[PDB]
Design an enzyme around this catalytic site. Structure first.
Site, PDB file in Angstrom:
ATOM      1  N   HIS A 153       0.831  -1.158  -0.055  1.00 47.93           N
ATOM      2  CA  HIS A 153       0.032   0.018   0.015  1.00 47.93           C
ATOM      3  C   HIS A 153       0.843   1.230   0.019  1.00 47.93           C
ATOM      4  O   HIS A 153       0.279   2.463   0.175  1.00 47.93           O
ATOM      5  CB  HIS A 153      -0.900  -0.031   1.075  1.00 47.93           C
ATOM      6  CG  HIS A 153      -1.932  -0.968   1.326  1.00 47.93           C
ATOM      7  ND1 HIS A 153      -3.016  -1.030   0.655  1.00 47.93           N
ATOM      8  CD2 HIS A 153      -1.797  -2.198   1.967  1.00 47.93           C
ATOM      9  CE1 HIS A 153      -3.692  -2.127   0.987  1.00 47.93           C
ATOM     10  NE2 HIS A 153      -3.186  -2.773   1.565  1.00 47.93           N
ATOM     11  N   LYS A 169      -8.947  13.469   4.016  1.00 45.24           N
ATOM     12  CA  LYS A 169      -7.866  12.299   4.264  1.00 45.24           C
ATOM     13  C   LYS A 169      -6.972  12.523   5.486  1.00 45.24           C
ATOM     14  O   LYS A 169      -6.997  13.847   5.984  1.00 45.24           O
ATOM     15  CB  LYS A 169      -6.986  12.100   3.177  1.00 45.24           C
ATOM     16  CG  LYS A 169      -6.327  13.075   2.680  1.00 45.24           C
ATOM     17  CD  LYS A 169      -6.684  13.955   1.602  1.00 45.24           C
ATOM     18  CE  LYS A 169      -6.020  13.415   0.263  1.00 45.24           C
ATOM     19  NZ  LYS A 169      -6.878  12.538  -0.517  1.00 45.24           N
ATOM     20  N   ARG A 170      -6.113  11.615   5.850  1.00 38.12           N
ATOM     21  CA  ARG A 170      -5.217  11.762   7.132  1.00 38.12           C
ATOM     22  C   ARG A 170      -4.307  12.710   6.756  1.00 38.12           C
ATOM     23  O   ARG A 170      -3.950  13.035   5.548  1.00 38.12           O
ATOM     24  CB  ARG A 170      -4.518  10.473   7.279  1.00 38.12           C
ATOM     25  CG  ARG A 170      -5.305   9.308   8.119  1.00 38.12           C
ATOM     26  CD  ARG A 170      -5.856   9.923   9.564  1.00 38.12           C
ATOM     27  NE  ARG A 170      -4.749   9.835  10.239  1.00 38.12           N
ATOM     28  CZ  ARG A 170      -4.472   8.839  11.138  1.00 38.12           C
ATOM     29  NH1 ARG A 170      -5.186   7.598  11.304  1.00 38.12           N
ATOM     30  NH2 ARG A 170      -3.456   8.925  11.752  1.00 38.12           N
ATOM     31  N   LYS A 198       0.634  14.071   1.071  1.00 41.05           N
ATOM     32  CA  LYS A 198      -0.727  14.316   0.626  1.00 41.05           C
ATOM     33  C   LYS A 198      -0.899  15.626   0.443  1.00 41.05           C
ATOM     34  O   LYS A 198      -1.752  16.287  -0.230  1.00 41.05           O
ATOM     35  CB  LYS A 198      -1.664  13.762   1.644  1.00 41.05           C
ATOM     36  CG  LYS A 198      -1.839  12.313   1.631  1.00 41.05           C
ATOM     37  CD  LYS A 198      -2.713  12.083   3.044  1.00 41.05           C
ATOM     38  CE  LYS A 198      -2.630  10.330   3.237  1.00 41.05           C
ATOM     39  NZ  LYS A 198      -3.695   9.908   2.336  1.00 41.05           N
ATOM     40  N   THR A 221      -8.503   6.315  -2.639  1.00 36.41           N
ATOM     41  CA  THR A 221      -9.979   5.542  -2.323  1.00 36.41           C
ATOM     42  C   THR A 221     -10.902   6.592  -2.275  1.00 36.41           C
ATOM     43  O   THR A 221     -12.099   6.854  -2.785  1.00 36.41           O
ATOM     44  CB  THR A 221     -10.243   4.429  -1.365  1.00 36.41           C
ATOM     45  OG1 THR A 221     -10.072   4.920  -0.225  1.00 36.41           O
ATOM     46  CG2 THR A 221      -9.300   3.371  -2.045  1.00 36.41           C
ATOM     47  N   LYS A 224     -14.720   7.894  -4.287  1.00 29.64           N
ATOM     48  CA  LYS A 224     -15.825   8.163  -3.538  1.00 29.64           C
ATOM     49  C   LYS A 224     -16.304   9.642  -4.093  1.00 29.64           C
ATOM     50  O   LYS A 224     -17.645   9.723  -4.434  1.00 29.64           O
ATOM     51  CB  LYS A 224     -15.695   8.436  -2.279  1.00 29.64           C
ATOM     52  CG  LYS A 224     -14.971   7.222  -1.369  1.00 29.64           C
ATOM     53  CD  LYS A 224     -14.774   7.325   0.150  1.00 29.64           C
ATOM     54  CE  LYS A 224     -13.918   6.349   0.548  1.00 29.64           C
ATOM     55  NZ  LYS A 224     -13.424   6.461   1.969  1.00 29.64           N
TER      56      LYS A 224
HETATM   57  O1  LEW Z   1      -4.625   0.507  -0.592  1.00 32.35           O
HETATM   58  C1  LEW Z   1      -5.593   1.416   0.100  1.00 32.35           C
HETATM   59  C2  LEW Z   1      -5.208   2.722   0.419  1.00 32.35           C
HETATM   60  O2  LEW Z   1      -4.024   2.341   1.560  1.00 32.35           O
HETATM   61  C3  LEW Z   1      -3.419   3.613   1.948  1.00 32.35           C
HETATM   62  N1  LEW Z   1      -2.543   3.680   3.154  1.00 32.35           N
HETATM   63  C4  LEW Z   1      -1.341   3.388   3.407  1.00 32.35           C
HETATM   64  C5  LEW Z   1      -1.364   3.336   4.929  1.00 32.35           C
HETATM   65  C6  LEW Z   1      -0.415   3.211   5.636  1.00 32.35           C
HETATM   66  C7  LEW Z   1      -0.149   2.423   6.683  1.00 32.35           C
HETATM   67  C8  LEW Z   1       1.094   2.317   7.475  1.00 32.35           C
HETATM   68  C9  LEW Z   1       1.706   3.091   7.367  1.00 32.35           C
HETATM   69  C10 LEW Z   1       2.016   3.924   6.235  1.00 32.35           C
HETATM   70  C11 LEW Z   1       2.950   5.128   6.151  1.00 32.35           C
HETATM   71  C12 LEW Z   1       2.911   6.060   5.134  1.00 32.35           C
HETATM   72  C13 LEW Z   1       1.802   6.019   4.294  1.00 32.35           C
HETATM   73  C14 LEW Z   1       0.835   5.319   4.309  1.00 32.35           C
HETATM   74  C15 LEW Z   1       0.885   4.108   5.331  1.00 32.35           C
HETATM   75  N2  LEW Z   1      -2.545   3.479   5.284  1.00 32.35           N
HETATM   76  N3  LEW Z   1      -3.406   3.412   4.265  1.00 32.35           N
HETATM   77  C16 LEW Z   1      -2.725   4.381   0.793  1.00 32.35           C
HETATM   78  O3  LEW Z   1      -1.748   5.526   1.172  1.00 32.35           O
HETATM   79  C17 LEW Z   1      -3.539   4.600  -0.320  1.00 32.35           C
HETATM   80  O4  LEW Z   1      -3.071   5.142  -1.559  1.00 32.35           O
HETATM   81  C18 LEW Z   1      -4.521   3.434  -0.796  1.00 32.35           C
HETATM   82  O5  LEW Z   1      -5.502   4.059  -1.427  1.00 32.35           O
END
Ligand code: LEW
EC number: 2.4.1.1
Length: 810
Positions: free
Chosen positions: A351, A542-543, A548, A650, A654
Site C-alpha cells: 500500500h 484524508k489523514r 498528501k 480511494t 468516492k
Molecule cells: O490501498 C488502500 C490505500 O492504502 C493507503 N494507506 C497506506 C497506509 C499506511 C499504513 C501504515 C504506514 C503508512 C506510512 C505512510 C503512508 C501510508 C501508510 N494506510 N493507508 C494508501 O496510502 C492509499 O494510497 C491506498 O488507496
C-alpha cells in the site's frame, strides 16, 4: 418515499413495529415513558439484527455443505463505520423501517446518528478492508475477515485553540449490538519461551499463554441473502495467570493490553513490542481457526485448494513463518512440502513505497518474543538466497539487497521481503503503483520471479458510497437506467446518453444543491459555523501527511486571500474551502499543518473585505460517518499528492461517484480515473513521476521557486513574520524551514501549475450547465472503481475462485 430504498409493505411495517416494541420492553427493559433516544436506536438495531440471523445461520450452513474454497482476509484494520443503515440497505428494509418508526412517532435519521462508528482503522488501508468484505459477500464468496477487536479504535479528534487534542474512542461503552461473542472458540496464543531440539524436531517450550476470544460480526451481501463473517480477536488472560493475590489479579491487564488500542500511525514505522504482539496475536489465533475449520470439513496437499490467505500489507506477515511452524513442528511435514503449501496459500498486497513505512523488525525483538519464528525466518532466507545465487551467479550485491535479514547497527528483518518470498502473488493497488514496484523497490524480486507481480486497482463499495450516503443521486440514476447498476456499476456508462438531457442536467444539479444545503445546516447545528451554500465546496479530506500536500492547498488558499485583498472590488467565484483529517499523535509536522489551517481560517473568516467570498473551515474528527456527509456535498475533490507517492487513493473514487470534479496530480488511481473519464473532464496539473525523477537527479532547490515567484515569496514572508500568528510570530518557523530547506515532496515545484489549474476550475463553475455536464461524464465513467470489480479480479487472478451473483433462498 424513494424507490431504491425498497418496499414498505403493510405486513412488513406492522411486523417491524411490533418487534420494535417487543425489544424496547423485553430487551431494553423500558416503556415509552422513560425511554431515551439511545434506547430507541437500540430497539431498532435489535429489530434489524433479527432479520440477519436466519440468513447468517444458513449461509454458514451452506458453506459447510458445499465446502468451497475459503478466502481469509487478514488485516489489523477494519474501518467499518456505522452498521445500522448499511444493514437495512443490503436487506432492502430501509423504507419499511423508515415507515414503521415514523408511525411510532420517531425520526429514523435521528436514531441513526446515535450509533458509534466502529473506528477500527486509520484511513485508506482500513477502509479498503471494509469495502472488500462488502464486495465479497455481494459476490457470494465464502470469505472471512480476520482482525483484532480493539477496545479503543482511532482517537476522537478535538480541536482546541487550533490544536489537535486526542481522546480515547470508547466505542463499546454502551455495548455493540452487532457482535456475538463466541467463547467456545477461545484459542491459546504463545509468546516468549525458548527452543529445544529433540531427536524428533524442534519444540517451543516455557511460553507465556494469552487467550484469544473471537467476536463475530455479520457481513451482509447486497440483496442476495448472503451473510459472511468478520471475526475479531480479543485478548484474555488465563485464570491461573500470575497465580500477593490482589496484584496477580490486577496484573492480568498486562496480557489483555494486547487488544486494547489501535496504533494510530498513518506515517512512520514504530518498532514497538506491543505492536509486534498484536501482529502475532491475530496471526496465531487466525491460523489455528483456519486449520481447525479445514480439518472439520491429514492431507495438507489440498490445503491451498481450500484456503486462500490475503495479507493486508506486511502487518500479518508472520502468517508465513507461523504456517511453516505449524506444518513442520506440529503436523510433521517436511520443509519443502510445507513451503509449497505456504507459498500457494499466501498472497501479499502493498500500500506504499515510502521507505519509512516499511516494517523492519529488530532481530533482538523477535529473538525474545518469538524465538522459533526467527529460526524459521533464517531458514527461509538461506534457502531463498541460494535460489538468488543460482539465478544471478556472482552478483554479491543483489544477495545483500534481496536478503530478508538486513545487516547494520541493529540487525533487522525486512517483512516485505519475507512476504514476497512466501507468497504466490504480490500486488500493487493502482497500475502506476504496481509499475513503480517492479521498477524500483521490488525490482530485484521482479527479475527473479516476474510471474508473482500483479496489479489490482482499488475500488469502493457503491452501497455505502452511493446508495447509503447519497440516496437522491442513486434515485435520479435509477429513474433513467433501473436499479441493476448497484451491483453492476459499469452500467453507469448508459448515463453518457443523458449528458445533453435538460431534465437530467437539472436533476443532477438539484441533488448537489440539496446535499450542500443539508451539509451547510449540519455545520451550524452541530458546530455553530456559518457558510454560503452557493459557494464552490472545495474539499480535501484524508489523514494529514506531508506527501498528501495539504500544505499546497494552504498556499492556494492564502494566494486567493491575498488576491482579494489586492483587488477587493473585483469579482471572484466564492469558495468554501474545507480541509479535514486526523494527524498521528507523534507526527509533529502533521500537527503543525492542522494549526496552520485553523490559523488561516482565523484571519480569512473574519476579514470584512473578504465577506462570504472565501471561507476556510477545518472539518473536525474526520471519520467514516463524516465522510458519508461531506462527500455528497462536495463540488471539488482535492487529490494533490506528489506524483509517485499516493499508491492509489480511494477517497478520490468516492468523490467521483458522488458528483464532484477532481483537481489532482497524475498519481495513484487519478491516472486511471482521468483515463476512464477523459482528460478533458479532469483537472490535471503538476509534475508527472518522470518530472519528479528529473528534479531529484538535478537536486531540488526550493529557493529557486521563492526567488522567481513573487506571489509565493509574499506567502512565505507572511508566515515567517507572524501574519497568521500575531501573538507568537515564529509559531510556523518549522513549516517555512521545511518548505525552504528539506521538503521531500516538492510543494513549491507544483505551486504555479496548481494555482493556474485552480483558475480553470473557477471559470468552469461560472457556467453551471457546463460544470454539470462534466460532472455527468465523471459519474458515468466511475464504474471501474467499484470494489466489486477489484474483488472479482482478486478472485479470478489470485484466489482461484469464481464469484456468483446468485441469491441464496430467503
Ligand atoms: O490501498 C488502500 C490505500 O492504502 C493507503 N494507506 C497506506 C497506509 C499506511 C499504513 C501504515 C504506514 C503508512 C506510512 C505512510 C503512508 C501510508 C501508510 N494506510 N493507508 C494508501 O496510502 C492509499 O494510497 C491506498 O488507496
Amino acid at each position: 418515499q424513494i424507490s431504491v430504498r425498497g418496499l414498505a409493505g403493510v405486513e412488513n411495517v406492522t411486523e417491524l413495529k411490533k418487534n420494535f416494541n417487543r425489544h424496547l420492553h423485553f430487551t431494553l427493559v423500558k416503556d415509552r415513558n422513560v425511554a431515551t433516544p439511545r434506547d430507541y436506536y437500540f430497539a431498532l438495531a435489535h429489530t434489524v439484527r433479527d432479520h440477519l440471523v436466519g440468513r447468517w445461520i444458513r449461509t454458514q450452513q451452506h458453506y459447510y455443505e458445499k465446502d468451497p474454497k475459503r478466502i481469509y482476509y487478514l488485516s489489523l484494520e477494519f474501518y467499518m463505520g456505522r452498521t445500522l443503515q448499511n444493514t437495512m440497505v443490503n436487506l432492502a428494509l430501509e423504507n419499511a423501517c423508515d415507515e414503521a418508526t415514523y408511525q411510532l412517532g420517531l425520526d429514523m435519521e435521528e436514531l441513526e446518528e446515535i450509533e458509534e462508528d466502529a473506528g477500527l482503522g486509520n484511513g485508506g488501508l482500513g477502509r479498503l478492508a471494509a469495502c472488500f468484505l462488502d464486495s465479497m459477500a455481494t459476490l457470494g464468496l465464502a470469505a472471512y475477515g480476520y482482525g483484532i477487536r480493539y477496545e479503543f479504535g482511532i482517537f476522537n479528534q478535538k480541536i482546541c485553540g487550533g490544536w489537535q487534542m486526542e481522546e480515547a474512542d470508547d466505542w463499546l461503552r454502551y455495548g455493540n449490538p452487532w457482535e456475538k461473542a463466541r467463547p467456545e472458540f477461545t484459542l491459546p496464543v504463545h509468546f516468549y519461551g525458548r527452543v529445544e531440539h529433540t531427536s524428533q524436531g524442534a519444540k517451543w517450550v516455557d511460553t507465556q499463554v494469552v487467550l484469544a476470544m473471537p467476536y463475530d460480526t455479520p457481513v451482509p451481501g447486497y440483496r442476495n441473502n448472503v451473510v459472511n463473517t468478520m471475526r475479531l480477536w480479543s485478548a484474555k488472560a488465563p485464570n491461573d495467570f500470575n497465580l500477593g493475590y490482589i496484584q496477580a489479579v490486577l496484573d492480568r491487564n498486562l496480557a489483555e493490553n494486547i487488544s486494547r488500542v489501535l496504533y494510530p500511525n498513518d506515517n512512520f514505522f514504530e518498532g514497538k513490542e506491543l505492536r509486534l504482539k498484536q501482529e502475532y496475536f491475530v496471526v496465531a489465533a487466525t491460523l489455528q481457526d483456519i486449520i481447525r475449520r479445514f480439518k472439520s470439513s491429514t492431507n495438507f496437499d489440498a490445503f491451498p485448494d481450500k484456503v486462500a490467505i490475503q495479507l493486508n500489507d506486511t502487518h500479518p506477515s508472520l502468517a508465513i513463518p507461523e504456517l511453516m511452524r505449524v506444518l513442520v513442528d506440529l503436523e510433521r511435514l517436511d520443509w519443502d512440502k510445507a513451503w509449497e503449501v505456504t507459498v500457494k496459500t499466501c498472497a501479499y498486497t502493498n500500500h506504499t513505497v515510502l521507505p519509512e513505512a516499511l516494517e523492519r523488525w529488530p532481530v533482538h525483538l523477535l529473538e525474545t518474543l518469538l524465538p522459533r519464528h526467527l529460526q524459521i525466518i533464517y531458514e527461509i532466507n538461506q534457502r531463498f538466497l541460494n535460489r538468488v545465487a543460482a539465478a544471478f551467479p556472482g552478483d554479491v550485491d543483489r544477495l545483500r539487497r534481496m536478503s530478508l535479514v538486513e545487516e547494520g547497527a541493529v540487525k533487522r528483518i525486512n517483512m516485505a521481503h519475507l512476504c514476497i518470498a512466501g507468497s504466490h502473488a504480490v500486488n500493487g493497488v493502482a497500475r502506476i503503483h504496481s509499475e513503480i514496484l517492479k521498477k524500483t523497490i521490488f525490482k530485484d524480486f521482479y527479475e527473479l520471479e516476474p510471474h508473482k507481480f500483479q496489479n489490482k486497482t482499488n475500488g469502493i463499495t457503491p452501497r455505502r458510497w452511493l446508495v447509503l450516503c447519497n440516496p437522491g443521486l442513486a434515485e435520479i440514476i435509477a429513474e433513467r437506467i433501473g436499479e441493476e447498476y448497484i451491483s453492476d456499476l459499469d452500467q453507469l456508462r448508459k448515463l453518457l446518453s443523458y449528458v445533453d438531457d435538460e431534465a437530467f442536467i437539472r436533476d443532477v444539479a438539484k441533488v448537489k444543491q440539496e446535499n450542500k444545503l443539508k451539509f451547510a445546516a449540519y455545520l451550524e447545528r452541530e458546530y455553530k459555523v456559518h457558510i454560503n451554500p452557493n459557494s464552490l465546496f472545495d474539499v480535501q479530506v484524508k489523514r494529514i501527511h506531508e506527501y498528501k500536500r495539504q500544505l499546497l492547498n494552504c498556499l492556494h488558499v492564502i494566494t486567493l486571500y491575498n488576491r482579494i485583498k489586492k483587488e477587493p472590488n473585483k469579482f471572484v467565484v466564492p469558495r468554501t474551502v474545507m480541509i479535514g483529517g486526523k494527524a498521528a499523535p507523534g507526527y509533529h509536522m502533521a500537527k503543525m499543518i492542522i494549526k496552520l489551517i485553523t490559523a488561516i481560517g482565523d484571519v480569512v473568516n473574519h476579514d470584512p473585505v473578504v465577506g462570504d467570498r472565501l471561507r476556510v473551515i477545518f472539518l473536525e474528527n474526520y471519520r467514516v460517518s463524516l465522510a458519508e456527509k461531506v462527500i455528497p456535498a462536495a463540488d471539488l475533490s482535492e487529490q494533490i499528492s506528489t506524483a509517485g507517492t499516493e499508491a492509489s487513493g480511494t477517497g478520490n473514487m468516492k468523490f467521483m461517484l458522488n458528483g464532484a470534479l477532481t483537481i489532482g496530480t497524475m498519481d495513484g488511481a487519478n491516472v486511471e480515473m482521468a483515463e476512464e473519464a477523459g482528460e478533458e473532464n479532469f483537472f490535471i496539473f503538476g509534475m508527472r513521476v518522470e518530472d519528479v525523477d528529473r528534479l531529484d537527479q538535478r537536486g531540488y532547490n526550493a529557493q529557486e521557486y521563492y526567488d522567481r515567484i513573487p506571489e509565493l515569496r509574499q506567502i512565505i514572508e507572511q508566515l515567517s513574520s507572524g501574519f497568521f500568528s500575531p501573538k507568537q510570530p515564529d509559531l510556523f518557523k518549522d513549516i517555512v524551514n521545511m518548505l525552504m530547506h528539506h521538503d521531500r515532496f516538492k510543494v513549491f515545484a507544483d505551486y504555479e501549475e496548481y494555482v493556474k489549474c485552480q483558475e480553470r476550475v473557477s471559470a468552469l463553475y461560472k457556467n453551471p450547465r457546463e460544470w454539470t455536464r462534466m460532472v455527468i461524464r465523471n459519474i458515468a465513467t466511475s464504474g471501474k472503481f467499484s470494489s466489486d470489480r477489484t474483488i472479482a479480479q482478486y478472485a479470478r487472478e489470485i484466489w482461484g475462485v469464481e464469484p456468483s451473483r446468485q441469491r441464496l433462498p430467503a
